Amino acid sequence: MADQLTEEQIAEFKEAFSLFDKDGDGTITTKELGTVMRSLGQNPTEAELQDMINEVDADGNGTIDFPEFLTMMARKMKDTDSEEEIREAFRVFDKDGNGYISAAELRHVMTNLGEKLTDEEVDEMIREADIDGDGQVNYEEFVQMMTAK
Amino acid sequence: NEAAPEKPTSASVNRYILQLAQEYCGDCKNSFDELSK
Amino acid sequence: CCAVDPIENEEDRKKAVSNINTLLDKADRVYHQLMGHRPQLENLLCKVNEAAPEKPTSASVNRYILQLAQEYCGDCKNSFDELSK
Amino acid sequence: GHTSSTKCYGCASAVTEHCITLLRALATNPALRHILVSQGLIRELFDYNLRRGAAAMREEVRQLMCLLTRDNPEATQQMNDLIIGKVSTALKGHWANPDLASSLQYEMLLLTDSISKEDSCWELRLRCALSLFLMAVNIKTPVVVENITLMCLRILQKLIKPPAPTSKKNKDVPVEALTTVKPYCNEIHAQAQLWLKRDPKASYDAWKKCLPIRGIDGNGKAPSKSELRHLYLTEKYVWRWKQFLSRRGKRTSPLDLKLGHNNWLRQVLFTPATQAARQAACTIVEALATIPSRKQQVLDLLTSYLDELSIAGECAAEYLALYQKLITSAHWKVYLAARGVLPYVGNLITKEIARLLALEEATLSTDLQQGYALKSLTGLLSSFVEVESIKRHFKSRLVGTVLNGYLCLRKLVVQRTKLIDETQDMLLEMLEDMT
Amino acid sequence: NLRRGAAAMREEVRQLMCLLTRDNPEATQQMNDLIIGKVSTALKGHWANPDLASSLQYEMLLLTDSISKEDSCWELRLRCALSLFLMAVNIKTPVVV
Amino acid sequence: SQEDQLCTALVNQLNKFADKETLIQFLRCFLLESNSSSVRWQAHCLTLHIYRNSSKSQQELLLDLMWSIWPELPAYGRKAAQFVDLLGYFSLKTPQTEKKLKEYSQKAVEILRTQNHILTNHPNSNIYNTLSGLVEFDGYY
Amino acid sequence: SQFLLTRLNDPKMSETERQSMESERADRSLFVQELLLSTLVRE
Ligand SMILES: [Zn+2]
């Protein structure tokens, strides 16, 4: 799955991992896990970091070595998001599973995020996310929204 | 007011400032006190 | 005149090197002492600029001007002369 | 025998003192405050009584003028307009007359007192202070730096770093633990260019409305794996939705956290006119680096500033003392090493050693600050090296530089000081540690 | 150089500036324009700051020296002096007088 | 606690007997024209306690009397610290209408403006202004 | 000490408003930090 990455990128990832090795065993701790590819020129968020820790550190040891490090990095430079990821985001937005994300579920998710907005603003963003004129976003609308560049 | 630098520590103050102090606080004060009396 | 003993052999060179190191250390100490005066000078400059009237003949001059004269022409001059020597 | 002379200076001065005291007493009533400010009292107190009288009377009129604008935006705007106009008029011809810059101290003192008193019109006074700062931050003349930029930097320093809390509930927690909003990691929503032009869409409340609240973590339960996944992509795609809305709609577009490598920060941090300006700039930049995302850019810019050690030898004493504090942790050192700062420092050391040799060959003049920059750079390299990862990894590329520098320094015979000797000792210790 | 240096250097630069306009109407006009502009700018805010009137002595000394030396551009210097006179003759403040 | 109503009764008696001119003369004689300061402090206390124990109408009458005396302030110079203290306290404590407030503020600002004009055109103003920042002196000789 | 007008400065504040003031100071410090950061961005 990591064959799409050119050899110099593997070399520079090994460079970063080795420089970030503490005890010389080829294994680092997860507290500085952010700093490693954080030092390579990419900019993550804390939710990104905790999700990345969760995905690999299933045993809860909090310690990472090279193969799964390459596993994480191989899924970072991709620009076109995998349709499974977009579909799962659609499902998360579609709490009731009806396939249509009305304003109310959007309000619930935005309040869960901690962000506050007015009813007029969310109605406005919903109506600018609608192409069929029904004022209701669906899977095709979401996909064509995320593919817009 | 011209503040021209002058070349030569209580004696190192500008001579014109010393003259101003002597003329005002030394003589005018005496004259004012006599006049008030 | 400012002159030092001449050098004729190696032990004299060693003595000269040691003496020059000692003189450099003394010069550094005097230099730091001299350059320490500047913050007080700028504080007195800012105070003088306000020109606030003060109530109490050479003693009737403003006290901040007297302090400026004492600090500059009395102490900085001595430090500068020692450093030059 | 109880009547004063008609033309008496002292009696008129005393009447003015009594007038100021009575007006200060009267101003404590809001209605009388409004009537007085409507009479046209601010301009009168600005034009005459600011500079005339004893020092106590001058601070009293400053207090009265501050009080007259306690909660009146129009009065605050009028006072700010007067201050800004006078400062700009003086600063236009500061270059042809130093007194114009040297005779602004009461205006700036009034601004300092106005900002130091917490009131509801703080934003306008902050705008005035920041406008005066950005108008006179690039002037090299020492009188402007001592009389304009210092006061603005002290105002900014007081605003960024508030006093320690005294409430019994918050007697221990630091200032970063009290904010009611959480700034975004990689975005800046405040924009000064629009703010300084009085844009309602770029105000303080508008900025606060765009930031999520700090979640009251009343439950200590560890969120499940699905919860973290949901949080992740919800944040991701909400951000993408907002980005598209800004791209097509009318919502403002936040700026990206990428700092420029040339700025006023470099002017202020190494100014030789005064030291308090450098110290205030150090405090400001230290306060600007709290969340690691901003500390990224702060440390990168400060590393970019590394080449100034030679030009501003002792004036860097503050700057270095901050850099070492910001990289005092191991992971920041190894991050900087990963970005390629070791060859940079080595090249700087070699260049300044070559300059030292070239100067030694030709002339015989003395310099009491010789070797300070080299001493600092070698100490910084040792600081980077002592940690085990970089020492084990970066030894094979730095041996040549260290040995060449040590031999070149040993060649010195006349232009030698204590700093050069200490540098040679540290370089030899480096060589013995690496081999 | 008008305000910096010892008094002898200041009078020397005054003499040099006077000599540079010995028979040049354009140079005389430029010098007069500078003097008039500075005096008017200071006198606009003299009422709110006495130093503005108290810190014009070198400009007026330059004008005095320029007029005191008989040359062919005397009319322009007289015009500058009379304009400054009629601009600041009705002000009661003692510093202006 | 009898002294409270005794003081109230005596204050009402004095207010009943005394007219405007007598109170005006008392103020001018023992708050402004007195060279001593102990007498001025005694008058300050006595005026304050006459004001406190009076009714609203007499309080307004006394405040108006003091605001009528105030324009004569320059003739007394430094001697009117207690007078302006009492005037400020009375104007701050007595509840009063808007027109009276505007009149009072106008009087204060007018006196301030006139004194500023006197200061900035004084023949000796330049000399004193320059001497202030160089020498230390008590009076204007 | 006998002057009445010199005692007019009597500032007092309770505890809840003290927490509110501390939170507001923190918010304003964050705002000025962001505003200063906005001026150093790359152009
Ligand atoms: Zn008098």
Swiss-Prot record, chain A:
Modified residues (N6,N6,N6-trimethyllysine): 116
Protein activity control: (Microbial infection) Inactivated by S.flexneri OspC1 and OspC3 proteins, which specifically bind the apo-form of calmodulin, thereby preventing calcium-binding and activity.
Keywords on record: Acetylation, Calcium, Cell projection, Cilium, Cytoplasm, Cytoskeleton, Disease variant, Flagellum, Host-virus interaction, Isopeptide bond, Long QT syndrome, Metal-binding, Methylation, Phosphoprotein, Repeat, Ubl conjugation
Residues the entry annotates as binding Ca(2+) 4: 130, 132, 134, 136, 141
Sites bearing Phosphoserine, chain numbering: 82, 102
Residues covered by region (Necessary and sufficient for interaction with PCP4): 77-149
Positions bound to Ca(2+) 3: 94, 96, 98, 100, 105
Superkingdom field: Eukaryota
Pfam families named among the record's database cross-references: EF-hand_7 (PF13499)
Cellular component, GO annotation: calcium channel complex; calyx of Held; catalytic complex; centrosome; cytoplasm; cytosol; extracellular region; myelin sheath
Residues where N-acetylalanine is found: 2
Modified sites of kind N6-methyllysine: 116
Cross-link (Glycyl lysine isopeptide (Lys-Gly) (interchain with G-Cter in ubiquitin)): 22
Disease: Ventricular tachycardia, catecholaminergic polymorphic, 4: An arrhythmogenic disorder characterized by stress-induced, bidirectional ventricular tachycardia that may degenerate into cardiac arrest and cause sudden death. Patients present with recurrent syncope, seizures, or sudden death after physical activity or emotional stress. CPVT4 inheritance is autosomal dominant.
Function of the molecule: Calmodulin acts as part of a calcium signal transduction pathway by mediating the control of a large number of enzymes, ion channels, aquaporins and other proteins through calcium-binding. Calcium-binding is required for the activation of calmodulin. Among the enzymes to be stimulated by the calmodulin-calcium complex are a number of protein kinases, such as myosin light-chain kinases and calmodulin-dependent protein kinase type II (CaMK2), and phosphatases.
Protein name as annotated: Calmodulin-1
Organism whose genome encodes this protein: Homo sapiens (Human)
UniProtKB/Swiss-Prot annotation, chain F:
Cystine connections: none
Subcellular location: Cytoplasm; Cytoplasm, Cytoskeleton; Nucleus
Assembly: Component of the SIFI complex, composed of KCMF1, UBR4 and calmodulin (CALM1, CALM2 or CALM3). Interacts with E2 conjugating enzymes UBE2A and UBE2B. Interacts with RB1.
Functional description taken from the UniProt entry: E3 ubiquitin-protein ligase involved in different protein quality control pathways in the cytoplasm. Component of the N-end rule pathway: ubiquitinates proteins bearing specific N-terminal residues that are destabilizing according to the N-end rule, leading to their degradation. Recognizes both type-1 and type-2 N-degrons, containing positively charged amino acids (Arg, Lys and His) and bulky and hydrophobic amino acids, respectively. Does not ubiquitinate proteins that are acetylated at the N-terminus.
Free-text comment about domains: The UBR-type zinc finger forms a pocket that mediates recognition of type 1 N-degrons. In addition to substrate-binding, the UBR-type zinc finger probably positions substrate proteins in the proximity of the bound and activated E2-ubiquitin conjugate to enable their ubiquitination.
Family: Belongs to the UBR4 family.
Disease: Episodic ataxia 8: A form of episodic ataxia, a neurologic disorder characterized by episodes of poor coordination and balance. EA8 affected individuals have attacks of unsteadiness, general weakness, and slurred speech. Additional variable features include twitching around the eyes, nystagmus, myokymia, and persistent intention tremor. Inheritance is autosomal dominant.
Protein name per Swiss-Prot or TrEMBL: E3 ubiquitin-protein ligase UBR4
Organism expressing this protein natively: Homo sapiens
Lineage, broadest ranks: Eukaryota, Metazoa, Chordata, Craniata, Vertebrata
From-to range in the entire protein, with total length: 3386 to 3526 of 5183
From Swiss-Prot, chain G:
Residue ranges, compositional bias (Basic and acidic residues): 9-26
Region (Disordered): 6-26
Induction: Up-regulated by FGF2 in gastric cancer cells.
Compartments where found: Cytoplasm; Late endosome; Lysosome
Tissue expression: Spleen, small intestine, ovary, peripheral blood, lung, kidney and pancreas. Expressed at low levels in the thymus, prostate, testis, colon, heart, brain, placenta and liver.
Family membership: Belongs to the KCMF1 family.
SUBUNIT field: Component of the SIFI complex, composed of KCMF1, UBR4 and calmodulin (CALM1, CALM2 or CALM3).
Function: E3 ubiquitin-protein ligase which accepts ubiquitin from an E2 ubiquitin-conjugating enzyme and then transfers it to targeted substrates, promoting their degradation by the proteasome. Together with UBR4, component of the N-end rule pathway: ubiquitinates proteins bearing specific N-terminal residues that are destabilizing according to the N-end rule, leading to their degradation. Does not ubiquitinate proteins that are acetylated at the N-terminus.
Protein name according to UniProt: E3 ubiquitin-protein ligase KCMF1
Species name: Homo sapiens
Higher taxonomy: Eukaryota, Metazoa, Chordata, Craniata, Vertebrata
Gene: KCMF1
Full-protein residues shown: 289 to 331 of 381
